[PDB]
Structures are given as structure tokens and as C-alpha cells.
Design a protein around this ligand. Structure first.
Ligand SMILES: Cc1cccc2c1C(=O)N(c1ccc(C#N)cc1)C2=O
Ligand SMILES: Cc1cccc2c1C(=O)N(c1ccc(C#N)cc1)C2=O
Ligand SMILES: O=c1ccn([C@H]2C[C@H](O)[C@@H](COP(=O)(O)O)O2)c(=O)[nH]1
Ligand SMILES: O=c1ccn([C@H]2C[C@H](O)[C@@H](COP(=O)(O)O)O2)c(=O)[nH]1
Lengths: 312, 312
């Protein structure tokens, strides 16, 4: 089935992954160098064996395509994926007045949830409405929207990296230079998340357009379900904006790890029988994907198994 | 055998690669997304089925480790690999006095060879001796020595990208951030070769150190034999300078192509029976690899088949 390379990659890390400590002081079971491919013409690979909310994928991808780095856009699409990183520059802030030394304390103490949630909804709210606050605690700076569409140049000017390569696909469909990169050597030593999705490159041969991701690091239970979808989505969109048909998404990993928290959750997923894969319908009369809205992308026939709850 | 993933990757591009035009207006047979791995503890993968001069590999890698971008160092190690790109800024030069509109004309007319060679040895020579000329026509600027060790920062300062990550391996052997990148979005639109070896990242688990290459583009007959060696060499060196043992080299491709010139040459190679793989002996009392010289790296027992001549 379309999603079987995931299940395979989750299995193989179980069966032969070696133990590895991490930045997080949770353990992991880990492998270096893996490649799964997905023939995007046989359907769309939103995993069926575990529910992955496509709505969350698309808003966040449309955030990136817009060159936006503000938690606000996300927030009016009921998308909280990036919420904690904005809250953090808030709880540290010199003018903060409310105790969140906070992610390490989610499950850790239930009575935190109350006043975490309270102080987190009290902040989401005020990003939504109060512009000064939003401009200040809601803008995440150097996350994929800037790297892709406004990469901070050395002359202080700003490069439209992704736009430029789409022109380049329109124009020189065959070059092997069709690279968008999110790895800024100038920024990775001191930056909240050095990007996991470090690079990708497009490729065109005889009608179809494919994309490969180099992902330096992959939480296989939480991160990879979303990650595969966002980047297969990206491929379709560009295929679309360029009039090409879609071919492959290739997912390449450096460190592909299962957290030790996630051991039971994965085995459970692994008993689930995957279901026929949904189809993606992009709106056939709009092409300038920098101009897509939620309704321009629709997912026919996703029939997932239930979500499996997971210690981040 | 150690080199069989090459022979496999050359075979697979024959048997199922699709036709593809290129920047060069030669044809190619081409595939997107491939991964071969090499267990560096079972020997060193200098291909045995075709002669690849290790001397050329090491001088050029020591050029890179030095942060050098001048054809001169290379030239005093009898290494002409990078020669043409320096000659080019010479033949264009406003003060040039000798007709080379030149690579498209190698085999094209034999009587060119005479006066190409003549005008090329006349230039190599004068890089070797005349410093002003060398500082000017011999320095290639933005090739791997600067990206790796002096990456041009936006404050006009210069980042020691590779040095920094080696410290980081010494210091945080487990992070999945151990990335050196050679892709400068600010520079790839107007730069002679946007780099083929776009990225790599190191990885450490339980004693061994591995490296993965993302190569955007690979001439499978000419480029890949050298490429695998240079990057397996890099892995050993860093394993060495960090006291780790060596584990894997993983070679990841975007566009892996066989030129149509190279069709006969490859089939021939494919009849050759590979031989047991040489061993690499790094000098066991020196560790600061930014300080290696040719004699600090030795190759026990390379027993190659003859070189196969090839239209670049
Ligand atoms: C799965 C995926 C993919 C891309 C980006 C993200 C995620 C994700 O789960 N999160 C995420 C969502 C929620 C929380 C929390 N709490 C922490 C991280 C992402 O930022
Ligand atoms: C194989 C390999 C690897 C890395 C870098 C290089 C090569 C190579 O053959 N050349 C090369 C050598 C000679 C010529 C010519 N003439 C053109 C290109 C490289 O610059
Ligand atoms: O889109 C994402 C973002 C983050 N992670 C995970 C991978 C790692 O387990 C974790 C920590 O990041 P690093 O240690 O690799 O920096 O974040 C993902 O899986 N997918
Ligand atoms: O180390 C190298 C450098 C260049 N090439 C080849 C790959 C392509 O066939 C050719 C042209 O480069 P691009 O078209 O990908 O830019 O150079 C290699 O194989 N190895």
C-alpha cells in the first residue's frame, strides 16, 4: 500500500535500530541514512493507520508558502502545532507578569495543565487581537517561511528562494540545481530549532515532477506522519503551478529515531491494516500557489484509524 | 564486495534509468533519489574495477581541509582535476593575449590539443611561480574550501563551518545537528558551479562515526568513483581526529545520471570482477587533520583494473 514504507521504516527501527541518547534526555532507538519513496500518482500518502489531520498540514503549509512566520495566521485556522515556541519568548519576556520554567511539565503535573492551558489560551487570544503583542511574541522569525521565501542575504536584502526555483522549473525544467535549502550556517549555531527539513530539491523528467527531502532528524511516531504529508503536498502544488504531472516524493533521513516513550504506541499502530489511500484534488482553475487558500486543496476519501495519544 | 553498490547503481541506471536532457547538451540516462552505503570498517571503497588515483583524491581533500581555493596547492601535487575552471577566468581576462571559446573543443579538433595543452601548461607554470597571476587567475573563490572553512557571513565575517562541527562532535557527539553545508542561496544563482556536494552530516552512535552525503547531481562514470572516495576519506579523518572508530558512509543522490557518451565504458567496467578492498592507514600519532599532509594518509593494497578513457 502507499504508506507501507512508513510502516516498514517504523518496523526496521524497532527490529535493528540501536539505542541512542538525545538532546531531550529521553532515550531513542535510532538509525542513520534511510530512504522511502512514494509514487504520488497512486494516491496521496496521508497515513491511514493513524489519524493525521490534513487541515493542520495545509494551513501550516500555506503559512510557509506565504513567507509568514507569525503564529497568528495559524491560530485563525485552529492550528496550534507551532504554539509553544511563541509562548516561550513570552514567558521569558522582561515584561511578563503571571511560573513556566513548561513543556517538561505537561504530564509531569496535572495541576500545571490547568494553569498552563489558562496562561496559553490567555496568550493565543491576545495574539489574535492585540497587534503589538503579536508583532512581538507571535512572530517566530527564522522558521520555514523566511528561509524559503525571504532568506536573509548578506547585503541585508532578502531572497525569494522558493519562488526563484519555481520560475527555474518553469524555465529550465531539467537542471539538477532545483534546490531549496533551509540551512543557514550563519544562524544554526544560535537559533531555536536548526531546521529538521534541511533541504529539498525538485526534479523533472518526461512530464512528471518529483521532490526529495533531506530531513536531518525525524521523530518517527510524531514527526514523520505530518512531514511526509507536508512535503507530498508541496510536490503536488508545484507540479500544479508548473502544469507538470506529479511523480515521486522521496523522503531521505539522517537520524530517524523512535523515542522510547513511543514504543507501545508504534506497536499498536503496527497492528492496524492500512486502508486505500486518499486522492488529492487541487483546484483546477487556480495556479499561483503562493495564492492558495484552504479551499483550493481538498482531500477526497481519507479514512483513518484513530489517533494514538503520545508523550511529545 | 565493498564497491558492489556502485556497480549496482551503474547497472540500475542502465536497466531502468529514463532518458533526460541536461545543461551540457549531451544526453543522460538518469534517476532521482538513490542511496548506497559503505561499511567503512570492512576496508576502504576505492573502486577496484577501475583505477582511481588516490593521490589525486587526497591532495584535493587536503586542499579542502586547508580552506584553500587556489589551484596552486593542487598543482604542486601534480593534481590537475580543477585546472580548467581557473584557465577560464584567464582566457576571458581583459589582459589575456594569445583562441579559446575550449572544453567543447578537446576531442573536437586534435590540432586544438597542441595549442590548448601549450596554452594550458604555459598558464599552470605561471600560477606555480608568478604570485600576482596566481592570486588572480588561480584562486577559484567559492569552491569547497571556502564553504566548509570560511563561509562568507552577512556581517562580512567568515564562518569555520567544518571546524565548528568537529568541535561539536568532540563535545556533543549525539546531536542530529552535525551538518556541514556547501549550498549558499545568496550565491547559487550566479556562481560557476553551484556545488554538487550540497550537504553532509555526521552521526555518532556507540563508538563509530558515520557521514551521509547529499549529492544533488552525479556523473556516475566520472564523478562518483572519486566522490565516494573523497567523502569516505573525510569520514575516516574526522573519526580519527575525534578518536571515534569509523562506521558508515552513506551516499545519497538526487539526479544520478550516466552520460550517453559513457555507455560503452560502463558496460566494460561491468565485466570486471571486483578485487578485495584496500585498507586505509591514518597516521596514528597525529590528530589535527586540518594539519594533515600527504604522508599522514596511506592506502595499503589497492589493486585496481586499468583506467577506462572517457569523454567528460
Ligand atoms: C508532526 C509535525 C510536523 C511539523 C511540525 C510540527 C509537528 C508537530 O507535531 N509539532 C508540534 C505540535 C505540538 C507540540 C506541542 N505541544 C509540539 C510540536 C510541530 O511543530
Ligand atoms: C571525479 C571528480 C571528483 C571531484 C571533482 C572533480 C572530478 C573530476 O573528474 N574533475 C574533473 C577533472 C578533469 C576535468 C577536465 N579536463 C574536468 C573535471 C573534477 O573537478
Ligand atoms: O518536523 C519535525 C520537527 C522536529 N522533529 C523532531 C525530530 C527530533 O526527535 C526532535 C528534536 O530535534 P533535534 O534534536 O534533531 O534538533 O524534533 C520531527 O520529527 N519533525
Ligand atoms: O564532483 C563532481 C562534480 C560534478 N559532477 C558532474 C555531475 C553532472 O553530470 C555535471 C554537471 O553538473 P550540474 O549539471 O548538475 O550542475 O557535473 C560530478 O559527477 N561530480
Amino acid at each position: 500500500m502507499l504508506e507501507q514504507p512508513y510502516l516498514d521504516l517504523a518496523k526496521k527501527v524497532l527490529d535493528e535500530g540501536h539505542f541512542k541518547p538525545d538532546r531531550t534526555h529521553t532515550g531513542t532507538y535510532s538509525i542513520f541514512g534511510h530512504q522511502m519513496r512514494f509514487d504520488l500518482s497512486k494516491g496521496f500518502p496521508l497515513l491511514t493507520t493513524k489519524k493525521v489531520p490534513f487541515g493542520l498540514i495545509k494551513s501550516e503549509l500555506l503559512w510557509f508558502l506565504h513567507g509568514d512566520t507569525n503564529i497568528r495566521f495559524l491560530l485563525q485556522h485552529r492550528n496550534h502545532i507551532w504554539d509553544e515556541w511563541a509562548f516561550e519568548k513570552w514567558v521569558k519576556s522582561d515584561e511578563y507578569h503571571g511560573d513556566m520554567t513548561f513543556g517538561h511539565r505537561s504530564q509531569k503535573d496535572p495541576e500545571f495543565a490547568a494553569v498552563y492551558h489558562e496562561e496559553m489560551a490567555k496568550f493565543d487570544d491576545r495574539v489574535l487581537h492585540d497587534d503589538a503583542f503579536a508583532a512581538k511574541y507571535g512572530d517566530l522569525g527564522l522558521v520555514y517561511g523566511s528561509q524559503w521565501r525571504a532568506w536573509h542575504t548578506s547585503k541585508g536584502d532578502t531572497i525569494d528562494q522558493l519562488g526563484d526555483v519555481i520560475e527555474q522549473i518553469k524555465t529550465h525544467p531539467y537542471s539538477r540545481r532545483l534546490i531549496v535549502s533551509a540551512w543557514n550556517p550563519e544562524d544554526v549555531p544560535t537559533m531555536a530549532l536548526p531546521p529538521c527539513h534541511t533541504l529539498y530539491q525538485f526534479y523533472v523528467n518526461d512530464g512528471k515532477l518529483s521532490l526529495q527531502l533531506y530531513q536531518r532528524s525525524a521523530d518517527i511516531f510524531l514527526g514523520v506522519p505530518f512531514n511526509i504529508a507536508s512535503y507530498a503536498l508541496l510536490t503536488h502544488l508545484v507540479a500544479h503551478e508548473c502544469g507538470l504531472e506529479v511523480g515521486e516524493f522521496i523522503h531521505t533521513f539522517g537520524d530517524a529515531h523512535l523515542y522510547v516513550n513511543h514504543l507501545d504506541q508504534i506497536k499498536e499502530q503496527l497492528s492496524r491494516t492500512p486502508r486505500p489511500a486518499p486522492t488529492l484534488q487541487l483546484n483546477p482553475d487556480k495556479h499561483d500557489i503562493f495564492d492558495f487558500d484552504m479551499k483550493d486543496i481538498k482531500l477526497l476519501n481519507y479514512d483513518p484509524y484513530p489517533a494514538i495519544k503520545a508523550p511529545v
